[PDB]
Amino acid sequence: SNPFEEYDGGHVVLTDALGRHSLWPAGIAVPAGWSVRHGTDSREGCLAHIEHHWTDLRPTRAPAGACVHELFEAQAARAPDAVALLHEADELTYGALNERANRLAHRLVGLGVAPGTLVGVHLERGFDMVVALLAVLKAGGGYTMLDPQFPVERLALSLEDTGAPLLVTSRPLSGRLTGTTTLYVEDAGNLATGVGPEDVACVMFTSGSTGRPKGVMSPHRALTGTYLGQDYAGFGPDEVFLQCSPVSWDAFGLELFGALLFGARCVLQSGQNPDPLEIGELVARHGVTMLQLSASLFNFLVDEVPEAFEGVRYAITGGEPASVPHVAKARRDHPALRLGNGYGPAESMGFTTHHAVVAGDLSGTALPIGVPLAGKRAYVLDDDLKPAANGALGELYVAGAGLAHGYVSRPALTAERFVADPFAGPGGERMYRTGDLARRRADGVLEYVGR
Ligand SMILES: Nc1ncnc2c1ncn2[C@@H]1O[C@H](COP(=O)(O)CP(=O)(O)OP(=O)(O)O)[C@@H](O)[C@H]1O
């Protein structure tokens, strides 16, 4: 049961100082920082109000932090000749990648890209893909990765939701997506567009569904908030990450930016889906130091490609409930391997919580999802939005720096899931309703139960 879906006493619409809208049950106290803009009304009536009024999701003390491309730029200045990307037998240095992305960024500016502009990127995995998305960020826009493994009808639909007036693609992919002004990625100082951390960096669309497109629109701050100042993996110039996760959803960022923001190497896997045998070969070839793997992929590699973990420093299972026996076996086979369980919705960006595996876990029936990343929060709430007592079952709501702005072109859906945070201080903040059931145990660690 959930009071944002079914509530006895009807609903109201709340807004904060940044013009963001939240659905809210009428019988529950209004959180600090929020004011009633509409209602009491029926749920459908509240949602209609939101659809009509909330026409721009972007929010309307100086912002802390550099943007994603700015941190990349500093790494490119620090070590222009360090290797940034590896793909098949080819390598691309930080310096060369920065120069290519600059050339393309200047082209984007001439075509009208500005802060607040979105740009579709329809490219197979390889250097051009990274040149293109960095170029979009540098020009101050947000990118949306259009994964070419998907049917064009679905890609076209997603692109339409974003409203992007520009598409970057390749000569071989030319003509698949039509009706949007298109430029070609095939090939230079840094730009200074005034873009900031609350500006949109990306819109993500899931690789794992055939339902109606849902574009998660997230600011630079949500990316940097997930990869900087964290300790769930090793970050630094001596790391070698492997970009094998689907390019258009949220696991992509850790692999690509977790490397580029730090001066590390990023190996790009050929093919749009994680390829277990190729992963094993790439780890051996390049000395990959961190793997991020969905649980099913993790379990297969542990059982059938054990050499994929040789030399690897951190492996993190995610996306679905971890298999304790496979985590245990990984530990037996690779004693120096640090193991983690990473949890979260794309709406809160990459990992919202993380659990470092300890010996005492390896005999359990389930692996805990751990504690929130620095700057992020997780609540376990009952259907009155009251925290669950210790060990009691409740629903997970997540909050803090990873939160997306919402779902592009879908303000009603955004307002029913990104809702007011009733625990936050004077400033109004939001929390995202995950739909996941969990328990918090005495020591504060979170246990995923399911849906
Ligand atoms: N480490 C982990 N352990 C268990 N479950 C996990 C997990 N990491 C992710 N999940 C599950 O996978 C989900 C990932 O969230 P998302 O990718 O945002 C789902 P979505 O595509 O937005 O669709 P939905 O929320 O409408 O189902 C989590 O909500 C959780 O159910």
Ligand SMILES: [Cl-]
């Ligand atoms: Cl150098």
